[PDB]
Structures are given as structure tokens and as C-alpha cells.
Ligand SMILES: Cc1cc2nc3c(=O)[nH]c(=O)nc-3n(C[C@H](O)[C@H](O)[C@H](O)COP(=O)(O)O)c2cc1C
């Protein structure tokens with residue numbers, strides 16, 4: 100007998116799967132659909148203090164090997180996600196993460212001051228989006244985490260952009276290890292500022308920023324696994340949430356091998372809808388059955404080096 | 406009717422194709438094979454002052470979507486590549502680039518001082534490998550460009566790692582634009598420190614650095630196009646050489662669209678051998694024929710934004 104059960108931050112999760120922040124989690128209908136899905140959890144769209152329209156369309160393109168987007172943080176604003184967490188979310192069904200992406204330190208501080216009460220009362224968990232972007236400015240990242248830690252009397256996690264250098268893994272891990280309240284690290288946000296060109300149209304495929312946008316899906320899996328494993332190794336006091344290139348139970352298996360506790364699904368969820376969670380749980384159980392694993396703890400972070 | 410001809414750096418190239426530094430360019434036989442190939446040019450393996458055995462094997466793995474490697478600069482040493490450039494290379498067949506990757510500023514300075522006379526006499530062109538790794542440290546990058554510019558009385562190019570943030574494109578371009586001897590930028594080196602995990606073996610697939618290695622091939626094409634275009638726009642005084650994810654004439658077409666003058670081939674060449682250049686010239690001409698382009702000048706850098 101087998102279990103996808105994950106236990107972290109005083110919560111039980113039926114399975115490690117959840118949406119990636121920003122994918123099918125902006126509207127009430129999406130948040131309800133994610134709650135009604137077979138997902139172990141869900142995270143609300145990264146919120147700003149006030150609603151944002153986001154970037155001009157097209158701002159997302161599905162690709163053979165994943166996706167490119169420059170959404171520009173279209174979101175209903177903090178009040179809307181706070182209200183969802185405070186009064187609508189069925190915590191009996193699954194735990195809720197709220198993604199926060201203040202455009203300044205003050206914005207994160209003011210939102211966290213108000214989130215604190217709802218975290219206490221309802222158990223919503225903050226995923227603070229740090230993804231130059233804050234996570235690529237080590238001083239700015241420490242300052243942000245200091246400001247948030249000062250005012251937010253709860254465990255939270257950080258959504259990280261990918262790093263590509265051991266010096267950056269070390270520098271980032273050193274900063275995150277200064278903050279015991281950072282109990283999880285979500286690796287990774289998009290591979291930033293890719294440029295998809297359609298050979299047929301001789302054009303870019305998204306409107307904002309001259310066609311430059313975050314890569315998701317198959318493009319990002321080895322980068323995601325690298326970041327998951329790098330932080331799994333350097334932040335042993337923290338859990339890692341995997342995000343990047345999950346289409347199958349086998350991909351999820353790789354995330355967990357690399358060190359992932361929770362496994363977030365972005366591009367694949369965008370393309371398939373929340374029914375994907377029934378397939379992914381089924382496929383991960385099938386991979387574990389074939390490999391004679393009963394629990395995720397048996398192979399989490401146990402990727403073999405040569 | 407049609408021409409792949411490229412005119413740059415006081416040279417004529419039959420076509421824009423060449424090997425990526427470090428692929429099929431370490432040994433005499435490889436350099437001869439590249440010279441005898443249909444490629445418009447070639448670049449010698451990134452060299453250190455002395456022979457290096459490189460990292461323990463396995464250190465390269467071909468993947469469905471590209472490759473991962475941690476070669477560790479296995480090379481015959483600077484004297485070997487200088488002797489090839491000085492005494493053996495048939496400049497009547499095609500121009501030659503020499504890739505240099507000193508492990509310190511001092512190493513680059515000493516090799517550049519000796520390269521100077523061979524560049525003068527024979528016309529070999531330096532590709533200085535800046536790919537934390539030097540180009541991710543803007544101070545180290547400025548240092549090595551200052552040192553090389555001070556001692557090296559010729560134009561040269563720089564092999565750049567990919568950036569993922571406009572702040573980094575701007576910072577890198579600002580530095581490169583301060584060095585008029587930098588006449589070409591090769592975008593990109595590998596996407597650094599990916600981690601490929603084999604679901605079957607539950608292991609990494611290369612031995613060095615716990616399985617972390619540079620990604621090439623399909624994985625890197627949108628990142629390569631982004632870097633090519635970003636530097637094409639921000640360094641209007643300089644040529645861009647494309648490198649990353651070229652398997653087909655169509656991929657090469659995308660590089661040139663993005664702003665590439667020369668198109669380097671790594672992973673695809675590693676898998677196919679130098680015969681690939683006959684296929685790539687044929688395919689790029691076929692793409693141009695179907696699109697009614699006669700010359701690369703007609704569409705270089707002309708990618709359409711929305
Ligand atoms: C349409 C879309 C919107 C996204 N919005 C957010 C966001 O609001 N917050 C966030 O942290 N990441 C956001 N991301 C990044 C994803 O959460 C995820 O890190 C990335 O897509 C990689 O996962 P994937 O390979 O499964 O797509 C978004 C990605 C997509 C495709």
C-alpha cells in the first residue's frame with residue numbers, strides 16, 4: 100500500500116501536487132476548480148496591493164517544449180485573495196497557499212501585516228514571490244525578507260527564480276538560511292526573458308517586452324531539478340517545493356528525487372486544466388509502484404551522484 | 406540567386422555556420438575535419454596556458470532535448486592551438502577563431518600577448534570565453550576585458566553566458582560597449598548548472614559537480630535567441646554570433662532573424678559530426694528559398710515584434 104501524503108507546516112497534503120502560482124488561480128472560479136481538483140494543494144495568483152490588468156495580449160503562448168509568457172501580474176489584488184483565504188476557501192478540502200508579489204518592500208510589508216491575522220485564524224500559507232528581480236539582487240532579497248520577517252509572525256516560503264551558478268546557489272542559500280521563518284523554497288519561477296521566434300511569421304509570439312518572456316514546461320525541467328537539488332542540499336532546515344517542467348508522474352518523481360516536498364504544475368496545467376491532477380497522482384503512484392516505493396519520504400532528495 | 410556569404414572582421418565566410426567552441430575542435434584531426442567541412446568557419450577548443458585532462462567521465466550526455474556536460478576545459482593547451490593557427494590552418498579554406506579560457510586574468514593576458522603576433526601574421530580571431538563565472542561577475546568581466554584590451558592589439562569577440570534579466574542585459578551591454586576592440590559577442594554558452602536526472606537509474610547522468618552541468622541543444626534555443634537579440638539591440642556597434650539550439654536550417658534562420666551574423670553549432674554537431682554543415686547550409690538555403698530571401702542581410706535582426 101502506497102501514499103502520496105506530504106506532511107509540512109502542521110498540514111497534511113493528500114499528494115504533493117498543486118498549481119504553480121499564476122496558473123488557473125486568478126479568479127474565484129479557478130480557485131474553486133483548484134480546490135475541487137485532485138491536487139494536494141493550490142496557490143492563489145501572485146497578488147499586488149491593488150488589482151492589475153497585466154500586460155497587453157498576446158502575453159502567453161503554449162509551445163511544443165513548454166510556454167513563454169509576459170503576463171505582467173494580472174491579479175484581482177490582495178483584498179480579493181485575502182477574502183478568498185479568510186472566508187471562501189474550504190480548508191477541509193486542502194491547505195491553501197497565497198502568493199504575494201508586492202512591487203516594493205513596503206507593499207509586501209503592508210500586505211503581510213494584514214495576512215498575519217488570516218494565516219493565524221484560517222492557516223493560509225504565504226508563498227512570497229521574489230521572482231534586476233529581487234532574488235538576483237542578494238542585498239535587496241535580504242532586505243525584503245528582513246522587512247517581511249519583522250511584521251509577519253508566521254512560517255512562509257519564497258518563490259525563487261532559477262540560478263545557474265554555484266556561487267549564486269551559495270549566496271542565495273546563505274541569505275535564505277538567515278531567515279528561519281522561510282520554511283520552504285519554491286524552485287523555480289520561469290527561466291526569465293527567453294525569446295520565442297515563430298519561423299513562419301518571422302515574429303515573436305508575445306506582445307510585451309519585444310517578445311521576451313518567462314519560459315516554462317519542458318525547457319525548464321533540468322534547471323528546475325538543479326535549483327530544487329541545490330537548495331535541498333544548501334538549506335537542510337527548509338523544504339523545497341518543485342516547480343518547472345512537470346507534465347507526468349515521472350517528472351514529479353524527478354522533482355521529489357531532487358528534493359521536492361510539494362510539486363507545482365504550471366504550463367502542463369495551463370494546457371490540460373485541473374483534471375491533470377487525477378492523471379499526475381495516478382502516474383506518480385504508477386511510477387512508485389514500478390520502482391517499489393510506498394511513500395515520497397523513501398526517495399525524496401535521494402538522487403544518486405556518480 | 407542565393408548566398409549564405411557573410412562579410413565581417415575583414416573576412417569572407419562562405420556561410421555563417423561554424424562549430425561552437427569545445428565541440429569537435431580539441432584535436433588536430435577535429436580541427437582538420439572542421440576545416441574540411443562545409444562550415445563557413447571554425448573555433449578551436451577553449452584553451453588554458455597548459456594542457457588540461459578536464460573533469461572525470463562521464464562528463465557529457467546527449468539527451469532527447471539536447472545535452473548536459475561538465476567537460477572541465479579538457480584541451481591541448483594554448484601552444485597547441487596557437488601552433489595550429491600559426492603553422493597548420495589553411496586560411497585559404499576558411500577563417501579561424503581561437504577560443505581562450507584562461508583560469509585567471511593573468512593567464513588570459515599571457516596567452517593574448519603571444520596570440521598578438523599570430524593574429525597579425527595569420528589572421529586567427531580571438532573568441533575570449535567569459536563563460537561566479539566571469540560574465541556573471543560584472544567586475545570580473547570588466548577586469549578581463551580591460552586586461553585583454555590593454556595587451557591584445559586586435560579586435561576580438563567574447564563568448565557570453567546567457568542572461569535572464571533586462572538589468573543584466575543592460576549591465577553586460579554597458580560594459581561591452583566600453584571596449585571597442587570587442588567587435589563580436591557570441592550568445593550563448595550553455596545554460597549553466599542544469600541537473601539531468603535519469604528516472605530509470607534515479608541518478609544524475611554526469612560525474613563532475615554532483616551531476617550539475619551546462620545545458621545545450623533544444624533546451625537553450627529561446628534563451629539563445631533572447632541573448633542574441635538583446636545584445637544585437639544593445640550593442641549596435643558589434644556583431645552577434647548565435648550559439649544555442651541549432652539543429653536545422655530553420656533554427657539557424659531564427660538565430661539570424663534575432664541578429665546573428667555567424668551561427669555556431671554545439672550539441673547537434675557533437676551528435677552528427679561535421680557532415681552536419683552540408684545539411685545545415687542546404688536546409689538554411691531551402692528555408693530562404695521558401696521565404697524568397699537571397700541573402701542573410703535581408704532578414705538579419707529583422708524579427709518582428711507585436
Ligand atoms: C501564465 C503563467 C503565469 C504565471 N504567474 C506566476 C505568478 O503569478 N507567480 C509566480 O510565482 N509564478 C508565476 N508563473 C511561473 C510559474 O509559477 C512557474 O514557476 C513556471 O511556469 C514554471 O513551471 P512550469 O514549467 O510548470 O510552467 C507563471 C507562469 C505562467 C505560465
Ligand SMILES: Cc1cc2nc3c(=O)[nH]c(=O)nc-3n(C[C@H](O)[C@H](O)[C@H](O)COP(=O)(O)O)c2cc1C
Pocket residue numbers: 425426427428450451465472474476478504534536564593594595620621622623625648649650651669670671672673675
Ligand atoms: C562538449 C561541449 C564542450 C564545450 N566546450 C566549450 C568550450 O570549450 N568553450 C565554450 O565557449 N563553450 C563550450 N561549450 C558550449 C558551446 O560552445 C555552446 O555554447 C553550447 O553547447 C550551446 O550550443 P548548443 O545548443 O548548439 O550545444 C561546450 C559545449 C559542449 C556540449
Ligand SMILES: Nc1ccc(-n2cccc2)cc1
Pocket residue numbers: 235236261262263267541542543567568569573
Ligand atoms: N550579479 C548577478 C546576479 C545574478 C546573475 N544571474 C545569472 C543568471 C541568472 C542570474 C548574474 C549576475
